[model samples]
Target: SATLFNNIELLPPDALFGIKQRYGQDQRATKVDLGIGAYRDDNGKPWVLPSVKAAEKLIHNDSSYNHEYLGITGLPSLTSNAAKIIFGTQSDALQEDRVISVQSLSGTGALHISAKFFSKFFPDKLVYLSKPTWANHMAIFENQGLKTATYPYWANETKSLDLNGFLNAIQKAPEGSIFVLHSCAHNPTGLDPTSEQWVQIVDAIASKNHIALFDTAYQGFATGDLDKDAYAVRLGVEKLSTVSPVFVCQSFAKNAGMYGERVGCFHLALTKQAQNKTIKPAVTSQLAKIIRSEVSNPPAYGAKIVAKLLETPELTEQWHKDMVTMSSRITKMRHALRDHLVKLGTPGNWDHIVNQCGMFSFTGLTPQMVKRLEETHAVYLVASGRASIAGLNQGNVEYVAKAIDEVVRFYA
Candidate 1:
């Protein structure tokens, strides 16, 4: 049996998706899904943003709209508006034509493009990631044949950001290394550095001449106010761009509730050398070539919808409201889970649940505890103790908390 692919090995299913599949197969009516990171309403149902629905209607009603291929760089409206949202409308980089933007499938796609670009141009440089970053982050860069190292992020003992360790790593790393920075809402662990801490981090990076790649998937979804959540990104562009070009991978999936639509953009703030008349176009041409060779062009539907919402004043206002609706619900659920666990007198501190923000909470539950909760109480979350807080609701919060209590006692 000498088949062409016979030697390929079977890879285990994705851990998160496997947990979801197991949750699906469970017959227990009380089963809760805290695995996948997606927003669910008070009724435990997926809620589409009102602004998205309105945008869809507008797109459908437009007489000029047509299904056609976008240029290699993708939609200008989507790209430009995406840049304005992240870097602010008056950004010097955008104004000076020093920013190169290309529409991507979503956050993952944007990261992939950045990884590929680094692998090709900066082949000798290493990509640095947080110790406990999004699980997919490691794979994405590694897949591009880029080596990755980790810096201190989560301080498990204190359940907080390891600021000192992080800053030290920045100083110790080789100059010109590519560091992937979560602009807001650190995934798998929701802790983010304060504005003051960000100043120090940016200063350290600039001193070391490190390249910053900001992944901003949950900008508005993190703090409800777009500008507030974009603090780090805007700061990076303002501070780091002077020493090195900063890259941003932005996604509208969470903010716009367009997960399946795959709307995102990849932005590169060019350095002075790359911003010259000749080099800028050459850099952009390479980016376009990467996009064209891979997906041929970005999808039209999602970008169009996002563009309309971002460009139209009324719809843009509605989109802001929709972000609040989603973020507020997640925040409420965090408090509810923490309150319930505290009321139950769970074995350990539960305040971290509320302290964490956005879609997930690093519950500090061990893998064994997570397994017992899933097996005995039909409560499902990742083995790393990262629970999708949006999965909680009025109907399931108490039950899930009780499960954690039982599991903690058993493990104790």
Candidate 2:
């Protein structure tokens, strides 16, 4: 068994997984887990949205509901509904039937399928990622034979988006180059482009004929309003799609509170509706082929739940409210942590905690400070200063704030 894979070099432990292990081993009662990106209730318990629970009950109650194999492209209603959720129900591209969507294995599977699609069909193989993007992005793209490069994203000095650097990179990348754009609630940094900024970025990418691969993991979770969170994605469809190809990978894990259900959708949009008839089926067939080869067919259980919630008007409304509940809690925690830090007179600007949107805050804690936080205070966060705001709640926000205050005063 050992001789069969001699070329494989053993790798170091995964950063997040390793931290999770250490956290589980610790028996401290007051330990604050600010590492993982799942939404937690005020009592530090994992929350299953009421809508999801309802959907599950309905699915199981239906006599017709069975674990039958879905089509290679997955449930049609799920994909179509997902397209409207991200692209807007009135999208001309969608109405014209120019868009091709397929259900995937949550966001990660959507990304992997997208990477594989681009690697297979795109003219150029180079994919430009934002500097310090989600840790798995590089590995996902590279694994599919798509070469990876970097574009400036978070500006350290400003603790904000590096707009100038971002646009510059977009301008400099070769024509037809693929770029990954986070749809909303950007991971780690929790920083996002304003409306005007998104316009400028889209203009630059369109002008340079660069393809956009949008990763929309957190849509309503960003602002609690589905349309507001989907603004950038809609803009890309409106402005950038006309000039360049556009791709979207939508995940229901974060939005639907169905993390383990693995519900996702992948979409491809041609530049114009004029090309709908020809391009739509061709692109869909290609994705279907890939799906057939890799997963055979996407899972049915998650898609059924998502479909139930999305297709039912009452359920959809409740899901929106559910999103607000999650987002509001995270928002409140952000303000709470900021208030505590400000009151404690913690060194460095604490404004980013309140200013940044979504479930994460790039607290700018140095590695040494992060280490001290974990080893001394039993507070856990990614070493790069990315703290999951969702992990903090009424129960432990004060403890986490104190830990940050001490770490900044000492290790920092």
Candidate 3:
């Protein structure tokens, strides 16, 4: 056991979970949970978007439904709509027919395939991850035995963004490198570069001929607007067309509130000529091998739900409306936290809490502060100090803000 499993020491349960478990089990009426990334209804329970529920029921009632195994590439309608949604229907790349899109079990599934494919095909390049990206990203790529590196993303000094270092890191990395990008709503931080800044970053990456591997988990879950949340990926693809391939691992879990369903898609953009020269066949075959070996095939129901939403016109409109509804609620909570923190006279700039978009806030809370919040305030969050803003609702905002205020002041 020691020799064969030397590097596989037993690990603890997921941090986001164990903390949430304690919070939910707490009897305190005021206990708040901000640990996990799932969206919470204003009433503090898991949200099942109306559009998603309606689509699921509709699919079940269609009577024409069958439990068929999808092709190695997945459903064409799903992949096509996913492409249109991600790259913008009017995108040059999509029109060029240069983008190869495939269905996945969700973002995680997409990342896994991309990781394995890259490991075998592009092993010469090191994978670059953000310093504080989603906890699973680093581990996912490394599991493929891919060499890993990190670009500067977190700025501990200002407790804001490290814009300069982010650009510098990409520039410093070798040309033709593979870098995984959180396409929108930077996980854990909930911070993003402005449009102009994004453009500059994309330009610089293209200049270096770096390949982009985007993981879009919170698409349309950020601005209540799909185009806005997908801007990074859209622009990155548009700008990075000249360099190495651009691959996106798009997750519909948050987008559709279909977490357990695990529905997502992957898109790869390269020169049409280059794509024809084996990229498409080779990549698809590899992804199929992984899918065939991993789960046999994606579950029929969850993705079928997403398929209905993407295909049917009525469901598509309803889906966007649902995103708006959920995103607006999260937006209000962001402001509420900032407003209350200011009133409480919490030290340090609290503007980041509001300025940051999407479902979380990189509240710059230290480990002791998070622990003190959990132990003393009955609030739960990631130890790296990321708070799921979605967990904040009118019912819990004031309490959360007060807890944050006390925690920050306690540490101060």
For 255-369, candidate 3 gives per-residue lDDT tens digits of 8888887888888887546446576677667777877877777767777788889888898999999999988888888898899888888888888888888888888888999
The TM-score of candidate 1 is 0.98
> What are the lDDT figures for the candidates, one per model?
0.90, 0.88, 0.84
Which 10 successive residues of model 2 have the least lDDT summed? 271-280
Residue-pair clashes per prediction, in order, are: 0, 0, 0
Judged by TM-score, which candidate is best? 1
Sorted by lDDT, highest first, which candidate order results? 1, 2, 3
Whose TM-score is higher: candidate 2's or candidate 3's? 2
* Per-residue accuracy of model 2 over 1-412 as CA lDDT, tens digit each: 8698978889887677677788999998879888878888888888999998898899999988788888888899899888988999999778777688889999999899888887887636689988778888998988888899999999988888899999999998889898999999998789999999999999998899888889999999888999999998888888865687788889998889888889999888787756567777877888889889988999899899999999998899999999999999999999999999989999888889989988998999999999999899999999899999988877888889999899888865
Off by over 4 Å in 3: 1-8, 24-27, 274-279
Backbone clash tally (model 2): 0
